[PDB]
């Protein structure tokens, strides 16, 4: 009766789709009318970070929002400084291939990951001052896409195999292994309360996980190409999703549906990094056509163009307070907008 | 200057770090990076062993030139989402087994993979050093069975030289661009000694091409 089982599963999927249709009442664009449009957005360059000598793949901010972390093509993980233009550290990675970087919310540790299928965590506030490998987390099969720090002892990971794992820095073996996906997973973003997160796999589906229980909570379809980046809304009950279809999509947690589509005919190249600006009214998006965007998160109309790079933008993210934006493109430059 | 005493030392340390990265980039950018794609368990081990988890590198220097053979075929993931990391490699050592035409056939699967990796938009100027191994096994199997079983287009005779030429033309015709990149074939074998010499010759050719393009003389 396995055929009956799979057909019943398909019928249940049709039923949940019908429930989603019924749960729909209106559109976010329809709701947000009679509201003041954001208007033109002019965001000049405020800093440039001309330290790297190759491509730049990832970026993260500290809690104080003054120290950058940049994953390069040649392993040269740098901890920059924001207000001035210096280099607090320069970490020579073991494997040059690094596709993610994460700076711990406590300012102590920093992580990196790439094709080596190993996430290495570096310690900074060390007596006998020198950045050293605190732990080489291993256990993933495919490549590694994004790591994020819950605290100074736990870290989450989205790998190249169809899994996302919650690690343990003290004892290098995994605590939980989230597995509900099909195809590789490219990005993930933790909650502002560090209780839930979603990972965007290439199967055009995003899943809502739960760190404690370990079981998947919700699913999020509605796309046409593979997801490339996700960052929760500052509220903690929504998340945008990067795409290869050049279609940012703002999902939500209590309606489980898809709210808005930030798609225009002019844009055709894919998305690389999406980061909500603080207070949520701006949805940044690093495209492939050497150009970012300042998409108005409530009204579909774009607010402004943010383009000063000469090659593909590969990472971006707003400060903690919301004072600046740090783009890292495939060139050797990080640009601090404000 | 209105820079405090500690901030001045911070700037000095930042400049020292800048110098360190500049020196590292100078010493490492001249180094030669040879990506190795192809079909695993078909001669990769033999060719690697000839020259003395996930990705694995191999830093061997021959005739005073530091090489980096990057065996990435063991990644076992989506080949289109991590291949862009390998832009800027000076070569792509492909690997085909002449005996793997009698096992969707694996020979035509390897042909498809070769076509996909040659025509990829990330690798348009980077050369490809095609390899062909199992010479003795191919000789035995061409003495045993004909070449038409896997090749419907072929119509000649089951002679080793003609078949080898046919394979050369076939694998050097699947490239849609014959101007921006070259393909260096080589009928190596298991017990071989000249593969490192041939790879050195090909890498000298490609580095001469890169020098000509950089200087703008081309």
């Amino acid at each position: 009766e396995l055929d009956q089982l799979r057909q019943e599963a398909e019928q249940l999927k049709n039923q949940i789709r019908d429930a989603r249709k019924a749960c729909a009442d209106a559109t976010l664009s329809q709701i947000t009318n009679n509201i003041d449009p954001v208007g033109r957005i002019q965001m000049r360059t405020r800093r440039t970070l001309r330290g790297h000598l190759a491509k730049i793949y990832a970026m993260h901010w500290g809690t104080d929002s003054r120290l950058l972390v940049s994953a390069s093509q040649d392993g040269k993980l740098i901890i920059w400084d924001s207000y001035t233009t210096n280099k607090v550290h320069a970490i020579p990675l073991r494997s040059s291939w690094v596709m993610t970087c994460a700076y711990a919310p406590s300012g102590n540790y920093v992580a990196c990951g790439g094709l080596d299928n190993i996430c290495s965590i570096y310690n900074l506030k060390t007596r006998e001052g020198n950045v050293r490998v605190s732990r080489e987390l291993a256990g993933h099969t495919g490549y590694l896409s994004c790591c994020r720090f819950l605290d100074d002892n736990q870290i989450v990971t989205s790998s190249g195999d169809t899994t996302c794992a919650l690690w343990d820095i003290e004892t290098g073996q995994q605590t939980t292994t989230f597995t509900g996906h099909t195809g590789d997973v490219m990005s993930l973003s933790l909650a502002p309360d560090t209780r839930l997160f979603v990972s965007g796999a290439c199967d055009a589906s995003a899943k809502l996980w739960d760190v404690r229980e370990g079981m998947c909570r919700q699913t999020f379809t509605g796309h046409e190409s593979d997801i490339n980046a996700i960052c929760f809304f500052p509220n903690g009950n929504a998340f945008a999703t990067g795409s290869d279809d050049a279609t940012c999509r703002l999902f939500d947690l209590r309606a489980d549906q898809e709210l808005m589509t930030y798609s225009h005919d002019n844009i055709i190249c894919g998305i690389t990094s999406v980061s909500f600006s603080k207070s949520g009214r701006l949805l940044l998006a690093g495209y492939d056509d050497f150009n970012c965007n300042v998409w108005d998160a409530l009204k579909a109309d774009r607010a402004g163009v943010l383009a000063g790079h000469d090659n593909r933008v590969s990472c971006l993210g707003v400060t903690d307070d919301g004072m600046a934006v740090a783009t890292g493109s495939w060139d050797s430059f990080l640009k601090i907008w404000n | 200057c209105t820079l405090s005493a500690e901030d001045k030392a911070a700037v000095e340390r930042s400049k020292m770090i800048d110098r360190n990265l500049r020196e590292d980039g100078e010493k490492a950018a001249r180094e030669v990076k040879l990506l190795l794609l192809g079909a695993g368990e078909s001669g990769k081990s033999t060719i690697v062993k000839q020259m003395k988890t996930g990705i694995v590198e191999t830093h061997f220097t021959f005739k005073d030139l530091h090489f980096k053979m990057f065996d990435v075929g063991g990644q076992r993931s989506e080949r289109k989402k991590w291949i862009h990391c390998f832009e800027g490699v000076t070569a792509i050592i492909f690997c085909v087994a002449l005996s793997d035409y009698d096992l969707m056939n694996r020979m035509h699967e390897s042909m498809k993979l070769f076509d996909s990796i040659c025509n990829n938009k990330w690798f348009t100027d980077t050369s490809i050093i095609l390899f062909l191994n199992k010479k003795d096994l191919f000789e035995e199997k061409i003495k045993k069975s004909p070449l038409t079983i896997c090749y419907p287009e072929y119509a000649g005779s089951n002679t080793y030289e003609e078949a080898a030429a046919y394979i050369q033309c076939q694998f050097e015709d699947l490239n849609k661009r014959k101007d921006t990149k070259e393909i260096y074939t080589h009928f190596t074998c298991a017990t071989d000694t000249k593969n490192v010499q041939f790879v050195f010759d090909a890498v000298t050719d490609v580095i001469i091409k890169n020098n000509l393009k950089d200087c703008g003389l081309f």
Partner: single-chain antibody, 232 residues
């Protein structure tokens, strides 16, 4: 992780010596190093400075052109050669390590050091307290003073606090104003405003007694303070 300054004794005045401090267990290249001396019963005197790679060197007023300091990076030693020692430069010296980046903590570890005996526009810091009595358990505060406003335009105010137990090398406590050095209890808390600062002690134990030298780092030659002796 440890510094031992060696070389010294009783040389005749106007002689010449070269000191040494065999660094072993930290990034000697990456950490800038200083030299601080102590008279028989006076306060600490800043002497010299070497940065990472010897890119910038500073000297005190009384040693400019007389003393010379260099680092031997491969050998892990640091040298302070001396020319024309007067009869007023008798002191037992300290080999200081330091580091400078955003959020660093200079003067964190201070070597035990060796002695040296010879026969026969300054940022003022006046520590008015001197041999102040205190009962073990009660909360007291060490006063401080200055003349040039240390509240720089870049926010942080550069001024430090160095406790010294008797017969022991001094240690960093507060690597800026209102911070806390690693391995220093939360009982201590810098609390100041502008150009008059205090060092609160929540409840002193039987071990946190001695002199609390408060030193400014806004501009060289890093004038120290007179210190405040602590008692029972």
């Amino acid at each position: 992780v440890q510094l031992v300054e060696s070389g010294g004794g009783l040389v005749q005045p106007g002689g010449s010596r070269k000191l040494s401090c065999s660094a072993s267990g930290f990034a000697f290249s990456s950490f800038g190093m200083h030299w601080v001396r102590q008279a028989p019963e006076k306060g600490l005197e800043w002497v010299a400075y070497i940065s990472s790679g010897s890119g910038t060197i500073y000297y005190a007023d009384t040693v400019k052109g007389r003393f010379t300091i260099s680092r031997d990076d491969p050998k892990n030693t640091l040298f302070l050669q001396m020319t024309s020692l007067r009869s007023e430069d008798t002191a037992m010296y300290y080999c200081v390590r330091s580091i400078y980046y955003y959020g660093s903590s200079p003067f964190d570890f201070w070597g035990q050091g060796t002695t040296l005996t010879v026969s026969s526009s300054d940022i003022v810091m006046t520590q008015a307290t001197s041999s102040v009595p205190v009962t073990p358990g009660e909360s007291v505060s060490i006063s401080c003073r200055s003349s040039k406003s240390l509240l720089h335009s870049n926010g942080n105010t550069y001024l430090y606090w160095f406790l010294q137990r008797p017969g022991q090398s001094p240690q960093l406590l507060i690597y800026r104003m209102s911070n806390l050095a690693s391995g220093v209890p939360d009982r201590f808390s810098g609390s100041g405003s502008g150009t008059a600062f205090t060092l609160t002690i929540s409840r002193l134990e039987a071990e946190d007694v001695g002199v609390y030298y408060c030193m400014q780092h806004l501009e060289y030659p890093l004038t120290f303070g007179a210190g405040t002796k602590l008692e029972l």
